[PDB]
Amino acid sequence: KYIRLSTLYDLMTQHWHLKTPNLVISVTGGAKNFALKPRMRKIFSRLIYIAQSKGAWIFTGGTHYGLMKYIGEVVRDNTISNVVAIGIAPLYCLDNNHTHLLLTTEAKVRTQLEKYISERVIPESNYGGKIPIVCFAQGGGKETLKSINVAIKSKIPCVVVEGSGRIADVIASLVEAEGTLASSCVKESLLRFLPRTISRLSEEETESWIKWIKEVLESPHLLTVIKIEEAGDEIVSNAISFALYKAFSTNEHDRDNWNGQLKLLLEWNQLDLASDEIFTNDRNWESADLQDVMFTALVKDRPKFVRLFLENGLNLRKFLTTEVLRELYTNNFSSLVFKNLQIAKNSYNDALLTFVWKMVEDFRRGRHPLQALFIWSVLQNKKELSKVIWEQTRGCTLAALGASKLLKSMAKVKNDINAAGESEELANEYETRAVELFTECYSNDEDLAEQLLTYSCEAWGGSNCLELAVEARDQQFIAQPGVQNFLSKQWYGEISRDTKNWKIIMCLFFFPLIGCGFISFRFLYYVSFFTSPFVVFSWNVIFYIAFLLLFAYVLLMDFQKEPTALEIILYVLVFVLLCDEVRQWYMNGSKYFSDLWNVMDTLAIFYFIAGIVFRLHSDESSWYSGRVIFCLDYIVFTLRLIHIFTVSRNLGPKIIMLQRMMIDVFFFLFLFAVWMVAFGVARQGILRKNEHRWEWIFRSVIYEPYLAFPEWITIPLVCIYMLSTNILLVNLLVAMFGYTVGNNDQVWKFQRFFLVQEYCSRLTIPFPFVIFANEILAWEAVMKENYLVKINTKANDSSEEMVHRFRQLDAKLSDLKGLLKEISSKIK
Amino acid sequence: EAVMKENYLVKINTKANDSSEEMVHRFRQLDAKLSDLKGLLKEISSKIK
């Protein structure tokens, strides 16, 4: 949009586009030669994204050269994600990337434009109104120094310089000094950095450059320098906001209006500036009007200011009212994560997620409120902000684990794998946040720690800290030596673990040996003995062994025609071994039958009742058919006993090698039985009874290989006998090393934990008797307060980077020249 | 993709942190400030005689 020039604001901000909540000015002029360094393009591309986040205008020289060409390429590429680049200008080629072009006699409406903008009060009023202006200067020469004085002296826009240029490095080096307003220190410099420029024209304009700099350094509170040693991220935001704050602070009317300077420093991210110049206690504030600033410090994603307002005094359990919490979930809860929650609730349903999905619903519909703000910041992956709200929670061994479940149950939703990936790495540093918070709680009194593991929590998720870890599969928390000691103290029960291993077993046989000092547990010690799950599991093996020796005895000597007294006890003991399975039919959820060995125990009893049905029929055809499906069930009641010994010896590091291998041979024998059906058909289809068919053939083809003309066809038959023995032997050896593929220390201790806690979830009564059946938290606050001090003590290896140890040398080196130039002045 | 490209080309030349953590230029800027002393301290004695 060309406009020839020789007020402007009305036809271009009402008929064309929006307002301008920021306005950056890059003063370069038509310098065709410009070294866009990889640092100089870092400044003027972070600036475009900052201006995109604020919706600014960029006034620059509208020509197709230098930085002004590089600027226009970034505004072209960033109108797809609201910067408007207004350009003001042999003949220079025009930059074909400025959406509104404003073509000596033209750098006077540029000054007339910005002063009309800088005066223009707007009732949004975050910078006291008055539309913040920055003037970025980086070049050298005539028009650069002119554009600083006509900026600074007429009205007040800030100027920002960097350490790369001809005259920008002059003013970058002329701020750590005093030179009587630099009436003779200008020519001391300005030929060291630009010697060719001074010998071009008249001295009366070179004399004027002294005046052009003495009007600049009158106000050094409007000139921020971007040094070279700001060699990190966020250096343009640390320079604009540091410049904009100076022009705000020196209005001499915001001493009462300190609240304007806080929302300015909150619109940007200036923690170190706000903590030193606003929250420094020589100013009078009350810390009760901080509440509308805190509500914007959350929803505008300021995780560093929410820590600042809390450490400056803010009762968060009194700030978090219910209308404040519903302004978060209804307005400031992002719809993408909320639609991610519905898919998280349906396909992976859990008691925790039903509590959270109820919580987001009735907060979007209509107490422990601090445990609801922590949910708000952990759902949307506020990674630095949820670490701050976690530090205020009443019980933090719990809430670090429960948030680790809320992330990991949403880290499996594959709608956005990045958000499901950031939730996975955030939950790992809540596992790690809850490991060391527990080992510090376990390096102290261990009985005091284990009461916290089984706390009722007043229904945070309704679960304890230990049960929240096993459902979330937090392998780092459960494999620590604190919890694995607690299980071994639980599985041995009230018996001490220092007796021996065999010393308990020599007391199961002989009941008078418990009453002696032969067991060293901790009046009627037998109830403590026969309720610890070591002796419960030790009873249900020697009873199960003695079950089989009277199942074998009734199958050889007895079992003539009458179900005698030895079989009636064999009837009811199977029913005793059945009446716990109807309680194993409880707490199953149709997935505890998905281990392929609880079902073989349940199909064992269902194969036994058919032997009872076949028994009391008095005919010899079903009596012998009742003996045979008793004898085949004798194998299954041994394969349960063998599977007991298989697990209970290799319960340890070999529990991940086993039961991954067990499915791998379950797959291999399935591929064997598929091949035996194939080899049966190729045997039935060759030998006789060729067409002699009934439903005989549907049952003979299976069992017939188990009991067991060449014109050119015998040579592929052995090639089949090479191809068939390959693909079965390969599956045999793949089953041999399926455990190998796939932090190996933590993964077996959790699998060791999950099996014993499945057996600790059993009733802790022996087998024949199954038919018969808030000031402790004041101690964890000290362990909590020592830990929160410890995680902010951790800046040792950050401070071993001696860039502040070199900076305190620089303060002591600045102590020299500030105090040594005064030594020479008292001599003359 | 040009913005993702331009953020990346800035990033690969931003990477001089562990090169600049070698403080041989942080010692060199001390040497410039130490050269600021002797260039400006020998002139203190000359105005006394």
Add this chain to the structure above:
Amino acid sequence: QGGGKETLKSINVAIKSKIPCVVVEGSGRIADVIASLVEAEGTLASSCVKESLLRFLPRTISRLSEEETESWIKWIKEVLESPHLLTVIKIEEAGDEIVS
């Protein structure tokens, strides 16, 4: 650790009457004044007090009468008479066991 009127009063009435020790740290308004005023000699700080004390706390001095602001010179010149009763907890004691 603090700043203001009653903090500087509670040091002089400590030190001058009998001898309890005082311990300051590098975080505060007037505590950082006395933290920075131990590596120096200023003729008992009769004119070096106002060289500081507005750099660290500028709003505090423009509140009341000069005759009590003149007294703050006396309130500090009685403090730095005995620098053997005033230990400073510096920021660069960034480890364990710094209070002991």
Add this chain to the structure above:
Amino acid sequence: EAVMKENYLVKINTKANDSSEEMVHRFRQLDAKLSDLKGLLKEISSKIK
């Protein structure tokens, strides 16, 4: 074995190399030499007036 013992007890207290490679005392001896300046440079201005 007392000589092999005495060389070893010296050796385990010799081991403060990687502790002393943390140059916080090498910066502290600069601070003593920087405190040597201001203790001896304010007296230069007082003999001129």
